[PDB]
Amino acid sequence: WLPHQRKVFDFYASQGVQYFTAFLIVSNFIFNCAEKEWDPYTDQLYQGLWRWGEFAFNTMFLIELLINFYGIAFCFWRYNWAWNTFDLVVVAIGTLTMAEAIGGNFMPPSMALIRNLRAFRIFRLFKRIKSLNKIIVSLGKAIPGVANAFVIMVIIMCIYAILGVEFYHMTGSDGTYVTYNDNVKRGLCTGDEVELGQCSLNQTVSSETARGYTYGEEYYGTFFRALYTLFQVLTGESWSEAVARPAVFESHYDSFGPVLFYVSFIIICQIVLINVVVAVLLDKMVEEDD
Amino acid sequence: WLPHQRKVFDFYASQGVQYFTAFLIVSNFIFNCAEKEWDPYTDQLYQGLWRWGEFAFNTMFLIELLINFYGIAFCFWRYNWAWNTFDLVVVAIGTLTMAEAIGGNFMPPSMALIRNLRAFRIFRLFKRIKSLNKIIVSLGKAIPGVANAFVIMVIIMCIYAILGVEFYHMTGSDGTYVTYNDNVKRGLCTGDEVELGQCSLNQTVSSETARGYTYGEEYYGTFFRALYTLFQVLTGESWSEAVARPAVFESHYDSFGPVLFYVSFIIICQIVLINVVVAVLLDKMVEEDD
Amino acid sequence: WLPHQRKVFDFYASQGVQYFTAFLIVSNFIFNCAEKEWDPYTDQLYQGLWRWGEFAFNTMFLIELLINFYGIAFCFWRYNWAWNTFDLVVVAIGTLTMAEAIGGNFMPPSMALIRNLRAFRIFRLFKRIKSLNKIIVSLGKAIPGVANAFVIMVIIMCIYAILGVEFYHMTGSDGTYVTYNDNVKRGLCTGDEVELGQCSLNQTVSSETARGYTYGEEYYGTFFRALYTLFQVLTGESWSEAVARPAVFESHYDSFGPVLFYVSFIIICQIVLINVVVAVLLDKMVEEDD
Amino acid sequence: WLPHQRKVFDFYASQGVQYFTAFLIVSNFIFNCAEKEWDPYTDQLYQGLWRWGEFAFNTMFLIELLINFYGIAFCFWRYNWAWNTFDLVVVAIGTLTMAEAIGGNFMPPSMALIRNLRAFRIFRLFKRIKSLNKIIVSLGKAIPGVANAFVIMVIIMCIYAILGVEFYHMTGSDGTYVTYNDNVKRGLCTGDEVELGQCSLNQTVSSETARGYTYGEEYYGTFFRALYTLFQVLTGESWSEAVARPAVFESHYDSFGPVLFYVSFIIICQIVLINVVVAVLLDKMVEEDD
């Protein structure tokens, strides 16, 4: 073992040092938040501030990592392997960022998504605060119980996605669909004006969405587009005015079809399946709470 | 009674053979999903791939069905009648699809909805995996308990649908409704300009929907249109900006009518009735879980 | 201290006097409601009515405060300090309003937000009615338990806000973004017309919102705009048709990016985190109920 | 007592006679539903059908009422007063409808809302079926417990309505509100073009709604308009894109005002208060269930 390992390790496990590292984690997260709030642009105004602040924070986190490993004989396989691994990863990326800032573009412009991993340093705060840790451990021990109902709900969503691609993937392909009125029957016009040509019972409504598509291509053009449409319907977002109603009204006497499609999907998936997923989730969490 | 049926039956009931059939079921479902994702068009690009893949899967499922029935003396009334029946149905339709692919269009172009039954083969996976089976059996033994509250909610929805057809089925029939504003009263204009004709207190807003209708014809034109509108309101989808608010502000001084209509519907049906339906559902399911 | 305080105090604690003050509180709140309903304009029609009504109510509430303090030897630190403090604050502001109405504009035009504090006098009704008090005390003793899950949910929302500002803060900056067609592949046009120029596979859809912005600037232009966008998505409001879908379909072949962004956010935050927050809230409240 | 009262009364209490009256109730409700589905128009096509069908149903229900009262000595104060009263009311209105159909317009054209009371005859089915009765009695014994939390939520909604009328009742009164963009700071234009006049940092977006109003007049023009707006926000309907966001982005630098307004309202009312109302409701119902 290292001749300086024991007292240094019990020093890093001290209450105050953990609280100080926590303060430093929260300050770094607030620094990233503030960068995105006051300086989000491409051509930044205060670039050196964020750069050297990230540099100083990465230096302090590297020193903290070294104090950590120095106290556990630099192994970190044996003691608290998960958080030590996550810390090693984030500080390794931070050192990569230091090198990138100083002496060149070590990484290709492609994988900057890894530079974006600074935001996830805040997850290290969950280890120190016993309440957030309690919440995330309950969540983790609750998710496998959810897995089954989740797989059932996804199976049904893919069934409905196949059905939707088969049925509606060409609704409004011309860019327009026709809906038929009840004009003469209701009172708005007399039957003679229709036969003469003064009024009509069909309206050639247009089908373009605000994304430039047609109704069918965007909402059910492919299987993943349809699965996404059914996710948006599962969360209840504009499922009628944008998704359902153009389909329901496009077909003049076959309105039972799309109506039953969307009503059955909503009932089954939304009500029953989402409530069962959430119910088993909360059940698992109250299990772990007690 | 087959000579080696007992030995054969055991093979079908083996763990590995059931897992292999399950793998084959999931692969066929993924094949259908992939067909709809990479080749959804009418004029397909790789038509032979999907055709002969469905053919091979149908052949393997037919062989599995024959191994099944050969092990139960080909009766299938006495042992596991429900799943055996469902399997017989889906493989019969698959054999119909094989015949359709090879030697002619046996079925009229009308009932292709039965060729679409391939997507529902995945339901056979629920029998083999004990967790999904555990979920669907709880759901099935929970639904009859829901029946009562569901019938109450539907009774109230049909009441509101009759009321809505009687009241609003002609709202905006001209295509336009007038709304009145407090321009002189609020400060936007002086009372003299109104009497002279410079300003007005009414705006002839148009009532056409994005479906080509008028507000009344589409949302409450008939009883089933109104019942569908009330379903969309029960799920909370654009109930105000699309459904309620044009009615509420069509009336000059009797805005209490539509307001009370939609507020009472939302409160009663949405909050109380949906939460009671879901509550008895989850109660029944937790009953069966324990 | 006072000679007859002992009897005056037990008189102010009487059932009937508390019920009368409650009636007076509710009448004052109804008076403010009626002012905003029948006379909301800037140039009011009946200004003296509301002014002198607020004056009379403030006078009666001042007399009630003096009867209160006269009964507790004018200390109010010792006995019921919280409600006495709130009452002193609101009646002090009411006396400020009396002075403002009579002999000048004592307060700058800036902080009228404090004249708006009349609406919050109704909170004094919660002290007298034992049921509303029972509800708000349970709520208060439930909120600290919520604090932890709330902080976790906010941490995740700020993570997603940083990610969103980095990714989408320039989506549609030109005011238009391009979405790509599958026209030749589907059947709507033949490949030759595209190469000749008769049809196209891209639509230059416009990105301006009904707020005059572009999609990126409004929804994720800064970190607080993005945090607000993610709040609107957390409540389920137009998260797809307004927020998600233009991003999802802006990308030609990398639609997995925005799709996974919004789907992961919705699942995690909406379903899991909101249900856990509400579950611990209701759990704490049922704890205090029993 | 009546000489024929006892056996007639125990005959009307028979299982089969109650089931037959139930069948007749459901058939009458289906008749009204079918009238609204197949013949909703003003100038009906089959008017005699609905008229004489309502006549026959009213005759049968009158005969049922007379058999009822004949069995209870025509008192109906003593035995089952509530349902007997409701039945007497609905059959009295039905007899009024018979008279109206035969020998003149007895009622002014104003109160036809009472002819619309046919739809509510179906409520008489709840007495005969022991499950629906079991649900509505639990609901009735659950509502008084809800009363307290409901009154708290309504108090907070009226507070927010007063605040909203004071703040936003004039937002966009000109019909247009100005919003400001970071064009120069972002990269879309250079600062010189702004000072010269080629670009700008403000966009005069229009504020008219699809009802013809301005944002302020419609959403918070008065206290009841504001209370309705806050109801629509409480149910989550377009609270951001229609209600919140124009207010939030109308303000240049004080966007914290409307943001905090709507965020605080949503959190408090929606999450906490709606979940507490529904929780005490379901708690009371599970109390009565067991």
């Binding site: 909360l282 059940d283 969490m285 007690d290 | 109660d283 | - | 929780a279 379901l282």
Partner: peptide
């Protein structure tokens, strides 16, 4: 919130 209620019940009844 039924999911919450059910979990609460199960926990209490199981303890009982």
């Amino acid at each position: 919130i039924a999911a919450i209620h059910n979990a609460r019940r199960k926990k209490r009844e199981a303890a009982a």
